[PDB]
Amino acid sequence: AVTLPSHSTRKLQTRSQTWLESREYTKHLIRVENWIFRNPGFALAAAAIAWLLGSSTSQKVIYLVMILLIAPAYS
Amino acid sequence: AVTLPSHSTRKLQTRSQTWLESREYTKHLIRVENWIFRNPGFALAAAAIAWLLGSSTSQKVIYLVMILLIAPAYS
Amino acid sequence: AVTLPSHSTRKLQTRSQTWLESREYTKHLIRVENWIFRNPGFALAAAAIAWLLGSSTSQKVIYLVMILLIAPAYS
Amino acid sequence: IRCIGVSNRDFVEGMSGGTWVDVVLEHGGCVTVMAQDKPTVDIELVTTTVSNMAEVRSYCYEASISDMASDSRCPTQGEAYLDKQSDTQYVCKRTLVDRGWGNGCGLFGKGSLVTCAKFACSKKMTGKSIQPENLEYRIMLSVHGSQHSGMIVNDTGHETDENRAKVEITPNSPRAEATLGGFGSLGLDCEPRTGLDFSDLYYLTMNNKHWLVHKEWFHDIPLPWHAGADTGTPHWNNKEALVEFKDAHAKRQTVVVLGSQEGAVHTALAGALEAEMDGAKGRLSSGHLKCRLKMDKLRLKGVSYSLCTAAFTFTKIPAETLHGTVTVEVQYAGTDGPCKVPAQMAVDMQTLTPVGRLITANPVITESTENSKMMLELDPPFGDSYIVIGVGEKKITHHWHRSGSTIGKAFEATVRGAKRMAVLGDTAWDFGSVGGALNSLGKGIHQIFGAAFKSLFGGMSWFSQILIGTLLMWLGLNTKNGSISLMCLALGGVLIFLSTAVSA
Amino acid sequence: IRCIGVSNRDFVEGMSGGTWVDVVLEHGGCVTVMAQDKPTVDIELVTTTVSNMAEVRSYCYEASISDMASDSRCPTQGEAYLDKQSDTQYVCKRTLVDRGWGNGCGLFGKGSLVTCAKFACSKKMTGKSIQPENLEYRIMLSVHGSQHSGMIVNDTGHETDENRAKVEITPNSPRAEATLGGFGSLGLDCEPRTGLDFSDLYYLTMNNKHWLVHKEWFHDIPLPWHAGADTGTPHWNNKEALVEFKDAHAKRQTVVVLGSQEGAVHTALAGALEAEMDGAKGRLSSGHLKCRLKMDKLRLKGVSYSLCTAAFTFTKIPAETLHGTVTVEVQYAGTDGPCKVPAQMAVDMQTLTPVGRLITANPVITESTENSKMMLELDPPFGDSYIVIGVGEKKITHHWHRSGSTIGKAFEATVRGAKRMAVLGDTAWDFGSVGGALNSLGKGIHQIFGAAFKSLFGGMSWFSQILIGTLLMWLGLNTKNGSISLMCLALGGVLIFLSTAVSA
Amino acid sequence: IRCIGVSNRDFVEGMSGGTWVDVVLEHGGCVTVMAQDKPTVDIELVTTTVSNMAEVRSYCYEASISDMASDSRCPTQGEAYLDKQSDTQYVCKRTLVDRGWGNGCGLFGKGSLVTCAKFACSKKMTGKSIQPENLEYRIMLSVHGSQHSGMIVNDTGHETDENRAKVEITPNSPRAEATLGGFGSLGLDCEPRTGLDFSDLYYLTMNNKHWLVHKEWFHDIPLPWHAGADTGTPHWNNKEALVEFKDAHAKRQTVVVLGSQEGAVHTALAGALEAEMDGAKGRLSSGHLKCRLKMDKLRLKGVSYSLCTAAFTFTKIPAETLHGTVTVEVQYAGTDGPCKVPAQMAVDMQTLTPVGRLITANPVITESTENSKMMLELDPPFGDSYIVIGVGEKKITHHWHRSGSTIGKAFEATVRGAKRMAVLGDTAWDFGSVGGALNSLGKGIHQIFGAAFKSLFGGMSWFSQILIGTLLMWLGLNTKNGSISLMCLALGGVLIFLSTAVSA
Numbered sequence A, B, C: 001a002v003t004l005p006s007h008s009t010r011k012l013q014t015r016s017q018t019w020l021e022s023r024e025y026t027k028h029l030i031r032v033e034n035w036i037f038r039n040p041g042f043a044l045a046a047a048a049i050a051w052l053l054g055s056s057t058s059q060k061v062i063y064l065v066m067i068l069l070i071a072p073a074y075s
Numbered sequence D, E, F: 001i002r003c004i005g006v007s008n009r010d011f012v013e014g015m016s017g018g019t020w021v022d023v024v025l026e027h028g029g030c031v032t033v034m035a036q037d038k039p040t041v042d043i044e045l046v047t048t049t050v051s052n053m054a055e056v057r058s059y060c061y062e063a064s065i066s067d068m069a070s071d072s073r074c075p076t077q078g079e080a081y082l083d084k085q086s087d088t089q090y091v092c093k094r095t096l097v098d099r100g101w102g103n104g105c106g107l108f109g110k111g112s113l114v115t116c117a118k119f120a121c122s123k124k125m126t127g128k129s130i131q132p133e134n135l136e137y138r139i140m141l142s143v144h145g146s147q148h149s150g151m152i153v154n155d156t157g158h159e160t161d162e163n164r165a166k167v168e169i170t171p172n173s174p175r176a177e178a179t180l181g182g183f184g185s186l187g188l189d190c191e192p193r194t195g196l197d198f199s200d201l202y203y204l205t206m207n208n209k210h211w212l213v214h215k216e217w218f219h220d221i222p223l224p225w226h227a228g229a230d231t232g233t234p235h236w237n238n239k240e241a242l243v244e245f246k247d248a249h250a251k252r253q254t255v256v257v258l259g260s261q262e263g264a265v266h267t268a269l270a271g272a273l274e275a276e277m278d279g280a281k282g283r284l285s286s287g288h289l290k291c292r293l294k295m296d297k298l299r300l301k302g303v304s305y306s307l308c309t310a311a312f313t314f315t316k317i318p319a320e321t322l323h324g325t326v327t328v329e330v331q332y333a334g335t336d337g338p339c340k341v342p343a344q345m346a347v348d349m350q351t352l353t354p355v356g357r358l359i360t361a362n363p364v365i366t367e368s369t370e371n372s373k374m375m376l377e378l379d380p381p382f383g384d385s386y387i388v389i390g391v392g393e394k395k396i397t398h399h400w401h402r403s404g405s406t407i408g409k410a411f412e413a414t415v416r417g418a419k420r421m422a423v424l425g426d427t428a429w430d431f432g433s434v435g436g437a438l439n440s441l442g443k444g445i446h447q448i449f450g451a452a453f454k455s456l457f458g459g460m461s462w463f464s465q466i467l468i469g470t471l472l473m474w475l476g477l478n479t480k481n482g483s484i485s486l487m488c489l490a491l492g493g494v495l496i497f498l499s500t501a502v503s504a
Ligand SMILES: *[C@@H]1O[C@H](CO)[C@@H](O)[C@H](O)[C@H]1NC(C)=O
Pocket: D150, D151, D153, D154, D155, D156, D157
């Protein structure tokens, strides 16, 4: 398959546990760092661009994250 | 639909006067006649938008006809 | 040869499909594409042909566009 | 019933007490009506055939050049004459085939050549013409009252019509009549004489597939004319619109007929209403008609019945249509003949409070033996509740629920109020009985602008009006001087809206 | 001779090369060339014939339907399947209709439905491909001198007679050559690869008329097609651009096979070229072809011919051809052998002083005893002059007047050197001349401003040109500096020219 | 007796004002009830079976190509054909190949071939469609009578008895009446509709491991498809997402069957519900259902018996369970009838005022002559109590200790509502068994939020919503104003919460 959409996005809030919450939240973490632990360089570079913005000492702040958050998961 | 498009685009310019040629000289001009003649009201509506744009002496002259001729062809 | 009538101009408004309505709204378009793609040249042509004597910010477009709306048809 | 589930269906609940409720009804589904003690009823403009009509103009779409004869005079040796050149049948040119010695002349120049072709037609389209009269309307009245679960569509009995009686509103008889089973007979005072416009309209008749075409347009097709009907072979004006022959500088007169013109016409008729003229009288489906209901004769029935007690086993399950209504087909376990069986919108606690409306005015069991079907169209409140049927203690309820919003209906009498409106101009603000002069507007203020719009942009089409509209919706977001602003972005957006509504 | 009068027959008395001189002999008329001493000849792109053509598509303009079928599905059962969906020879459109109590399950709502019609083509329209090979061009060669009674057109034994020469040139063999025993031979080597734009030109056929169409156009037609060749039901593509699916106000969705698109295409082709068909060979007219006809190996049949003794009896009043070239048709009744017709031009005749320059240079008569005839050109001077025969107390002298203006006719090769300019478009410098500077470059500044000028205006059918050419020529009159107030005047009015050098 | 230790039991405090047991049964934890006028019963929405369903779509998660057929054509023609492009049975794709002299093609480059594969299928994910109505629940309920660890365990033998009853509301029989005599009856005003909106809840079946899956996500994943279809020869749809057309270099076109996807649909399938099937019906768990019971018909048997005097003994030493409700199991002397078993856990011993609560309600030996071990509850007041259960001569006292202050209970029963809220959204203002102003105003205020906040944030798994909330709390106190920036750290405080509030 190509694109697989997540039934995650639209779960079903009930008292009984979801299909597999466990192993859910640990994956996004795994990837978004198991990515920077491979193509870490993108860090320092990605960081620069986060500097070339509204450089608010509380804004560059966000941007830095907006970039490293996206790279990892292709979007 | 079933538009069987424009060969008038590429005319194999030569000696022997192209297909149905004798006609085409006026045809695209007639369609745009039988049209205004019907719904002339596209007058105060057509000439209107003209003063509305640019305002130059020679603006409306070319703006009013910019649309007057696009009115049809898309009727 | 040319069947210049375009009843789709004189629509009737009822609780029904005006004959071949399905692909009505789309047709007029795909022939502006079948035109430009095969005539990419005119792309930039009407860019200044219009830009010049557009006499405005936006006006440039309402020209550049109301031109690229003639060529496809009345031509 | 007739309208328990047709998207178009609109509800006119006018307990105006005017003993009338002007109500626009076309082939776009229908309308139901209900008011005090009046068994909610369904009117459905079904058929609107055109009886006798005769042709106005016939066109040829399938030329067929028989034989081609021709003559060429030599340079100033005179001129080329062909005996046909006079007999209307053929059709010819008077070109200039340059010629000299090689070409058999005693001189060099432009002798003239006249190539004649005998023209003939293979298949054409005649434009039978129709007038207000020769028009017959077929309305179908059906009262929810008490009927059948499946038979809400059966349409064969108009003699047993305790509800579904077929009217037949002619132009010469604007007024009508209905026959029921103990219900008042109904009278609709209409206007077949002016319902849907017909002066501007004909019936193309080619290939056997016909369609209601405008008048304006039908007098401008460029093919061969044939006025009147045929006396066999006829004389066609414009016998060349099809015929085409262009010889360049040589003696070779290329007379090509040009083919067919089906697509060439089908294709240029994308606004023409499909119509099936069958047999004798042409039938038009997809019309429009404006009537009025004279609500006097119709007075409830089976009101004097006893609120029947037996339990009720829903034969099927409680549904909803695009209008929040609910079919609730139950059963009556054999306790006597005809009697009423009441229901309520039990808004939660037991049977205590009655809520929401009930569309069927009065439900009545008309059957004397055992079990029988009946279905109540209710209007469940915008939230939850049950459905009590029968009476108090031995009552069965079915849990039910209706979603959406209280103000989600205000986003519907408004969106449905752009269809009712944009497909009948001002003859649209005609669904609800005259409430005074307050209407000398909704069906007035429109013939003031709409009749000025008819001319102005009257001749448009989807694509078109957007580029003529959006430029307006833009001009009004950029008016430097004036009040243009308000009328601009308005007259712009409304156009583009009119298109972005019905059938788009 | 061959072209003693065809609109557009030009000359090249100026071979101006070491026997090397070019030309563009098109399907439109011909050219006569005569070097300082060489006999004069008439070449012409008589015909051209593609040979093998691999058909690419097989568009279909007439669809016929059948097996109308269909299926529905309540708003609960998901989709709707119909076996013909696995038929590929059936077209369908699945769409949600309406239903419920009255039609199927009962659960209300707009469930799904699909309908499948069958397919087939009543009349297709293949489009065979043309590849720069398989296009043997024909070229006719008719010298002058010994040639009578326009025995010119008469294309017989175009072989045996050395006064005629059949020259077919394939792109794999352009260096052909004429065998004119007596007048020597004619060395020619053309451009079969760069004649018309064969690359890009398909070859279609509705019924039987044949055309020439540009690729684009051929691959941008909605019509249901079949590509390559296949005997079984050409698995059609777009089986639906020619079929319609009526949307019933409610419940149905029925197909309606659009009508024959014949005249629809038969009209779309307007801008194309006509083309015949002989056998399998794609014969066509209108082509144009380049070449480098070497003037060597050509000789005046008779430089050693005693002048013909005494009969200048011409059986034809010496008519005159356009572009100013008197033609005479002398007949040497009293004469002998193959002697030199003693012709000549005389401004006064008082005392033989020529001022003509006949171009049928070195006129001769053969097997000439009596009954000998023969034709011959003549460039009469401006004003008055007498055609003539050298000696004879029977020396004919038909007075002749030359109309027009000396420098007047000049204005002609400016607006004719223009026709060859507009058409041919750039291969318009390859007329008769060896070039170096203002001739090698003329192209150099044309090829560049030929491509540029194509890209930004190709697609501009005629009516287009002028429009986006006049409303342009205005921009030039407006503004200032020239750099952008001239380039827009020039390309504004000149655009217009390729509009008047077309139909005129 | 049931609901004791369900890690999530909720004691619904009665009300001495009409029976409004408005309680939302969870399909998981549970809710017990208590009012003076009645014994104390509790319910556990045990099974939640779905009757029938519709096979909307079928997908294949393990296709299998079979026949690799390839066709080719050189620039000489348009495309390729290939026997199989006329079958649904396959899947084809056409493109170019550097067709040159390699194959002996006259022309060079440009070719176009097409390879295909017969598309079989190994395992298909058969989804479904379950209309909200036609499903059904099964709420079993028990009572604190004389039970003896007869809790949970056997349930069928227990239902043919007076203390354990099993009712089952259908969306059709929404008010079941559980009649457990010796006590009375039970009212049930359930909404077998506002359940889990099985509207958009297609029921999956991926290799007998079915999960109720959201509608959307069902249509959304593309691979093969076949449905609402008579299997027959499964005419598929799509298939690209399985047959992989990658042409090695540029001469040959190869196609592999992309891998099953079997478990990649298990990672896809990251939704919440897990279903179980019988095949017959959709047996499942994890759901909710809001009802209302009738307390009126439920008699306290006990207050009619002479309190029992003799010995008592803690067969099962008291066990504190889930927040301070202690079960004691005791047996009896051994020669008595149906009599009350006195029990007042108090502060002290002498002034043994009864302090605390008696979950049990009325504790009474079953008419037995044997040591009846009656299992019964009690709610000790925070601190040190004395579960004393006896006559008074022989008080089988006990030293108890509930470690929960009252303040430390309010803070932790604030969450027993914090989660029953964020798992029941607004159906949370439904535990409010009354018509209160705020119990009502709430279901409404936090309604245009359940609707808003959810619509604009209903797409983001755990992680994803912290990532937004935390971003909002920063948008919080940190910003230009504290005005429209309080509601930022406000609603941003919900998301951060909701994510962690479902976990614990
Ligand atoms: C129409 O009426 C007949 C009366 O005999 C009834 O039996 C039948 O069921 C009805 N038809 C339909 C549509 O079911």
